[PDB]
Design a protein around this ligand. Structure first.
Ligand SMILES: [Ca+2]
Ligand SMILES: [Mg+2]
Ligand SMILES: [Mg+2]
Length: 213
């Protein structure tokens, strides 16, 4: 009720993020700075692929000469012009400070945390943002010189309560050449994990009795 972030869910759970690839269109590089497109506008694009069960989402790709790759078990994915969304329920094992990090992103990524900005507790497809400041993290790779790597890293930390579920939604864009999406989590003791296994979860359809916010 007054949690403003957390869901209470009593249902069979499944490991992993839901990953969805959207249709890149020419000129989307200019939209990586657009607060409408990066929050909900991309949901107007055709969904090309959808899978579930991703617990280790980070990747770094650059293979000139071969423009496609296998991403999360999806074959023939264009990694140079990529629109990628992750959605899942983050579950705290203990009460304490958990972190979510986006490191050296190329080209751009945005992170929404909590039921008011990521998605609705009982409907992962119910997504709407109220303002352009709803995000928890936003990063874009701007050439700060002669370097080939984004030197910026971002971390969102929040005190979470044990047993509760927190909606998490990311959107990642690669415009050209290198694709770097390094998305990690941090435990209250400071341990940084690249694999979200046992912390990121999915549910099927949820009734009013199994889901409360
Ligand atoms: Ca790039
Ligand atoms: Mg398991
Ligand atoms: Mg336990």
């Amino acid at each position: 009720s007054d949690s403003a972030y957390a869901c209470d869910i009593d249902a069979t759970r499944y490991d992993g993020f839901n990953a969805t690839i959207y249709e890149f269109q020419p000129g989307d590089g200019r939209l990586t700075r657009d607060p409408v497109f990066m929050s909900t506008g991309y949901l107007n694009r055709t969904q090309l692929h959808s899978i579930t069960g991703v617990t280790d989402p980070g990747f770094s790709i650059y293979t000139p000469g071969v423009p496609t790759t296998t991403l999360y078990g999806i074959p023939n994915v264009n990694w140079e012009n990529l629109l990628l969304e992750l959605k899942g329920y983050f579950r705290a094992e203990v009460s304490g400070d958990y972190g979510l990090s986006l490191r050296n992103i190329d080209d751009s990524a945005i992170l929404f945390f909590g039921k008011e900005t990521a998605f609705q507790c009982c409907n992962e497809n119910s997504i709407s943002n109220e303002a352009s400041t709803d995000y928890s993290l936003f990063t874009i790779f701007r050439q700060e010189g002669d370097e080939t790597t984004n030197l910026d890293s971002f971390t969102y930390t929040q005190y979470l309560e044990a047993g509760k579920y927190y909606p998490v939604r990311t959107f990642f864009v690669n415009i050209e050449r290198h694709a770097v999406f390094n998305f990690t989590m941090t435990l209250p003791d400071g341990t940084e994990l690249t694999d979200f296994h046992n912390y990121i979860y999915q549910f099927g359809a949820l009734d009013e009795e199994q889901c409360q916010a």
